[PDB]
Amino acid sequence: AEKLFTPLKVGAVTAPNRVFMAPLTRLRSIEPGDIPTPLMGEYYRQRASAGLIISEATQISAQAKGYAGAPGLHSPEQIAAWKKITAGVHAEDGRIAVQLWHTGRISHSSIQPGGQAPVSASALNANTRTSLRDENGNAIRVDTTTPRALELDEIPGIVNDFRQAVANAREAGFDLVELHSAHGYLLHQFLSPSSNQRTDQYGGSVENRARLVLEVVDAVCNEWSADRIGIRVSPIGTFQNVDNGPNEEADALYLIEELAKRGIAYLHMSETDLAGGKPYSEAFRQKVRERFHGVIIGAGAYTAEKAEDLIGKGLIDAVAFGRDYIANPDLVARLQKKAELNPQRPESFYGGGAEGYTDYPSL
Ligand SMILES: Cc1cc2nc3c(=O)[nH]c(=O)nc-3n(C[C@H](O)[C@H](O)[C@H](O)COP(=O)(O)O)c2cc1C
């Protein structure tokens, strides 16, 4: 097929194809310590023919943690383990970005430092569930704990934690960093009027709601380089953990314009929740494309045909596939050859071990 398999310059690195591996939480890290494993290194290595791998969401700090089994990038042991994973990808001539998150109110007190309430823009429960582990280490669901609103004087420490995690990612050998500003996590909790009822300079107006994410962007650009920074947004639609308010399109375009001023490597748009949503209109895609001067990655139930169509139209540059990458380590070769895909086994997307993780065969 015609443009999916051609190179693309993505900030400081060049992808040999446009078939990207979306960030995918798999909840297989070691506890205690939230440490990446050899098995996770093998999983990533198997996928290194991707144009770019974007890692599972990774904590910037202990406080960022909201899921048992999700890895961090804040401790020495975590840095050491990730260095190995990046070295494995590089040994197979791949490229890998770390997605960095703070889960905010999508968390539980039992996995917070001190066992205390998690933090958010406002003290409003997400009214959803997260994943913990039981006494045998198996993934279980638990209702989210009501959070504590961050005090104004705590906000600089959040920005610093993102900055430090990006410094640690560089040390760890990642090619790029993806800020997780999507899916109702901390940055999005500030962005959304649904989850942010603050009356300080971090709530109310769109400019106030985007203030935190833009401070984080600035801090990480300064720490490393703008051509090493990507951002994931999900600014249109209703996600499990939050909606985008009553002026979603205008607010999205405001944010995107701001992000472009920073000259960052990429804009990754998660277009719908797993549960579905209204498709992006081509008019809205044009409006995004004229505001952002870097690479645009599209995601959300894409097929190869839709990817080619929108790439051919000059509307996006690359596609991130999530579940097809879970099941097909050599998704690039399969798409290039129009080969059949392995069937997905959703029961093993979260937790467990090798089964449903490293046992999906290549051609
Ligand atoms: C098991 C699983 C875990 C995911 N984990 C994350 C994540 O860590 N970060 C994130 O931004 N999105 C995550 N997503 C969303 C995916 O990155 C992707 O946007 C989504 O699966 C839709 O694309 P698909 O139809 O190609 O699977 C996850 C999706 C699934 C199914």
Residue numbers in the entry: 2 to 364
Extract from the study:
The flavoenzymes provide an interesting example whereby very few deposited structures have had their redox states verified during or after data collection. The ‘butterfly bend’ of the flavin (the dihedral angle between the planes formed by the pyrimidine and benzene rings of the isoalloxazine moiety) depends on the oxidation state, with the oxidized form being flat and reduction inducing a bend along the N5–N10 axis. Any discussion of enzyme mechanism deduced from the structure clearly needs to be in the context of the oxidation state observed. Furthermore, X-ray irradiation, through photoelectronic effects, will perturb the redox state in the crystal.
The photoreduction of the flavin in an FMN-containing enzyme during X-ray data collection was followed by Røhr et al., showing the flavin bend. We also observed this effect in crystals of PETN reductase; Fig. 3 shows the difference between the yellow colour of the oxidized enzyme and the colourless X-ray reduced form, and the spectra from the two crystal states. By monitoring the crystal spectrum after varying X-rays doses we were able to use a multi-crystal strategy to obtain a minimally reduced structure and compare this with the X-ray reduced structure, showing clearly that caution is required when interpreting structures that have not been validated with spectroscopy. If the spectrum from the crystal (or irradiated portion of the crystal) is monitored during data collection, it becomes possible to be confident of the redox state of the structure being determined. There are many examples of structures in the PDB that are described as having a particular oxidation state but have most probably been reduced to a greater or lesser extent during data collection.
